[PDB]
């Protein structure tokens, strides 16, 4: 299997875990904790990925060649030229 770390549940938490296992929602209190940590990691993994994405996007824009005046209508027109070629 894998490595082990010992965790200390609070009185109110032990009570709620007990009902869940009894109701059959979970086989054991240890599996419920395993779910809780996995959910937390997913959240952290996502947040870290998104924060890193934006950090890289910024340096990417700065390094993406030289700036040009802003005209939206040119962009709106340029996009259509690629749509027609798609068909």
């Amino acid at each position: 299997n894998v490595e082990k770390m010992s965790v200390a549940v609070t009185p109110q938490q032990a009570a709620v875990m007990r009902e869940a296992v009894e109701a059959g929602e979970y086989a054991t209190a240890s599996e419920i904790v395993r779910e809780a940590v996995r959910d937390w990691l997913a959240k952290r993994e996502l947040r870290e990925a998104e924060a890193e994405r934006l950090r890289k996007a910024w340096i990417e824009g700065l390094e993406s060649g030289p700036f040009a005046p802003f005209d939206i209508e040119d962009i709106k027109q340029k996009a259509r030229s690629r749509l027609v070629d798609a068909i």
Binding site: K43, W58, G61, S64, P66, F70, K76, A79
Partner: protein, 91 residues
């Protein structure tokens, strides 16, 4: 004056094409909405709060769920990027 990076233009065309799959018209409305939001920076340069988590002197102006990543220079505004915002915890 307002200048944009080659990446930022690529963002808006990508954004436009995505919406254009559903309706080309709707894509025009959203990009128009983005522009109106960028042009507000000429009168209100600090509408977007500083975003040190993204870049040293980066700022971010919110349009929909997308961010207008920009920087302020002497005499002009530099539009760096337009990326989707940090995604919510909803999984």
């Amino acid at each position: 004056p307002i200048i944009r990076s080659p990446a930022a233009e690529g963002d808006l065309v990508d954004i436009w094409l995505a919406i254009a799959n559903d309706s080309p018209r709707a894509a025009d409305h959203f990009l128009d909405a983005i522009a109106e939001r960028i042009l507000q920076l000429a009168a209100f340069p600090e509408s977007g709060p500083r975003r040190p988590d993204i870049g040293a002197d980066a700022r971010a102006l919110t349009i929909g769920n997308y961010l207008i990543l920009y920087r302020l220079a002497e005499g002009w505004i530099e539009i760096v990027r337009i990326v989707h915002g940090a995604r919510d915890v909803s999984t």
